[PDB]
A paper describes a structure:
A central feature of HD-PTP function is the ability of its Bro1 domain to recruit CHMP4, the major subunit of the ESCRT-III membrane remodeling protein complex (Doyotte et al., 2008, Ichioka et al., 2007, Parkinson et al., 2015). Crystallographic structures of the HD-PTPBro1 domain in complex with the relevant binding regions of SARA, endofin, and all three human CHMP4 isoforms reveal that SARA and endofin binding is similar to that of CHMP4 at the conserved site, but critically extends into a neighboring specific pocket unique to HD-PTP. Altogether, this study identifies the Bro1 domain of HD-PTP as a highly selective interaction hub that coordinates recruitment of endosomal signaling adaptors versus MVB sorting and receptor degradation.
We also showed that the equivalent region of SARA binds to HD-PTPBro1 (KD 11.3 ± 0.3 μM). As predicted, the 22-mer SARA/endofin peptides form amphipathic α helices in their complexes with HD-PTPBro1. They occupy a larger binding site than the CHMP4 peptides, partially overlapping with the common site across H5, H6, and H7, but extending further into the S site between H3 and H5. The SARA/endofin-HD-PTPBro1 binding interface is largely hydrophobic and involves residues F5, A9/V9, L12, L16, and F19 present in both peptides. SARA/endofin peptides lack the Trp residue conserved in the CHMP4 peptides, but L12 occupies the analogous position, binding to one of the hydrophobic pockets and interacting with L189 in HD-PTPBro1. The smaller size of Leu versus Trp means that fewer rearrangements of this pocket are necessary to accommodate the SARA/endofin versus CHMP4 peptides. Rearrangement mostly consists of a displacement of the R198 side chain and a slight movement of the K141 and K192 side chains. Leu16 accommodates itself into the second hydrophobic pocket and interacts with L202/I206 in the endofin-HD-PTPBro1 complex and I206 in the SARA-HD-PTPBro1 complex, consistent with the importance of these residues for SARA/endofin binding to HD-PTP.
Numbering used by the authors:
A (entry chain B): 1 to 361
B (entry chain A): 4 to 361
C (entry chain F): 2 to 21
Write the structure that this text describes.
Amino acid sequence: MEAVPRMPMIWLDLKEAGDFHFQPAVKKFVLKNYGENPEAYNEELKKLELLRQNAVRVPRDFEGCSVLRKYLGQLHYLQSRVPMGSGQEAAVPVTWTEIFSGKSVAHEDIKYEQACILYNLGALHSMLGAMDKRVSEEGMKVSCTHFQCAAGAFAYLREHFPQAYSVDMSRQILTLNVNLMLGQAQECLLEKSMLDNRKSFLVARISAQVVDYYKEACRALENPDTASLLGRIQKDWKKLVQMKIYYFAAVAHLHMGKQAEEQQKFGERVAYFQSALDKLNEAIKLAKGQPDTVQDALRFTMDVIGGKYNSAKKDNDFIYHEAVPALDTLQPVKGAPLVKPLPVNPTDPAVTGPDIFAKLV
Amino acid sequence: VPRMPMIWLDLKEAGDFHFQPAVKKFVLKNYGENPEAYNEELKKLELLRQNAVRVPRDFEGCSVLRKYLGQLHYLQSRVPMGSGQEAAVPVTWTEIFSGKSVAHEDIKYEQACILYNLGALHSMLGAMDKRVSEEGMKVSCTHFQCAAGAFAYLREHFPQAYSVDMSRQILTLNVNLMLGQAQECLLEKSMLDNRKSFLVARISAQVVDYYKEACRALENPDTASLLGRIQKDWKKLVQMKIYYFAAVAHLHMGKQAEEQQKFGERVAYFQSALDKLNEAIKLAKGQPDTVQDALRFTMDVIGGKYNSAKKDNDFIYHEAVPALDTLQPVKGAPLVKPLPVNPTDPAVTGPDIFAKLV
Amino acid sequence: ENYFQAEAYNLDKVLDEFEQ
């Protein structure tokens, strides 16, 4: 399974920004509250303006993630000194396009700007994770980290912005994104554990956790409220995720059979390979109409499993003569979560750089 | 610029938290045989706790508590050690005001007390600096905001008071007290930065607002009986600061009037400032000379400015001295907030200890 | 800072811990 073709990965689109005309409000605030000349802070106002321009049309590359983090941090610094939140003195309209309906959604709340930047940070990470071919050890670790970062941005959004500014950032939808990104992160790590030929029981647990994440993501995709919101996107994701559920369940039992082989449980060995083959055949059924990237991985795995089943059944029938136990007689494989949503500290000075607005207050 | 003394909170004393037996029991049934693989992940947390519960009272002391607080979150994510859960063990800490030992079989009790001590340590580091230089005022201000943030997080995420020192009313007292002192540090900075007199007046008025909030809690009978002597010493300093910074506020309102050539209004504000200061001196009885020296010098400033203002008005300007209700009160300008704690920040927690406890 | 690169590099350590 070292050379198994890599499955395609899902990525989210970035939200697109409207207007955020903070400049008049900051100068209104400094004039009225500080009794100072607002033009003394024009330079701090250029930096944030230039920083926003870069962030709202961020380039889709690794460096773009730092641009979004730095702008996210500077928004926190600005909010600490100028009250631009909901119902506050210096608040101005913040407009962003809700990604699923295309509606313009406006809030006089700087936290709305923060939320959408954080959403795009998670989206951008998902893109960078999905772009890599994951041929080399480096690509698998970089993609895995990208997906954990994407899960971390969506998780932070879910926890610290509980009031959903738009339906694309509701708790249910962000939970879908997190579970999907963790499933894809765990998947990359599974590919790593195989290329390193880790202990077979280890791979089986890692693969079983891939199933668990995708099952939770699939439960949200089957929720009618999510289906009507995502529309055709829900159909595209569900097809791939449901197929992956059975594919990686087959991979798990494939390696459970490898473990049985190592412990000389030769009857148990054929049972797991038989189960792995049945689960894969269901994945193949669910994969009909999907691109060749998917088919090549399934075909490749069918050769592996099919060959191992014939070997195990021939060994048991002519040498070991051990009873083939039913599946329920065997303790199930418990998934091992080795990935997590990586926490975000928006005001970490090491990522935000100097506070643009240190001269205020 | 006068520099008043600052209040700080003592750290809670930790008792026993014998998590090793429960973890080993949990991993044996749920993950099978070998306990030996997990003993070092348990010994690393144990040493982390020993450092945290004997944290040195310095800046990195905060990182030690932060690091341990984060690893506790990682442990709770893998081993169910909350109240009513499989692997819960007794957690014992000393309630700081009564000295009584309080035990809960809940890992969130350990987290709460570590978080409390993080806020207490910040208050100490903020109150230790003499605030002579711009960096000292801002550093202390950050510490007091971090202390407010720790007590606020405790108030929001642990609503069920594990002990009376962490009840909603007492944490609210701590937050307002810490924000008042943070605001006070920025007031001092705004004075040495020569900010506009109207802004200094608003900043000082907000100091009064925070301390009034703290003072109403200190006057609550149930808090007085719980805090004991501490309520006396806090209230004595807070009540004095209420009138002192109300005088500082009206001092600078009178200086704004001077800038706008409302020389009658100028007398009214200086007269009001002097009266408020005299009450602060009434309330400052028995307080250390740091307090007395600050008040004595402020009396020189306000007392002289009142005499000059009244002489000028009586012989030159002859403008009507308005009472006091005719002038819109000063609106406070909050410049400080409880800073987020970020308990699971990888930059401070380091790698997750229990990567084997999956 | 190198948080992203540090996390990606640590994945080897993660699997190593989980293997022992």
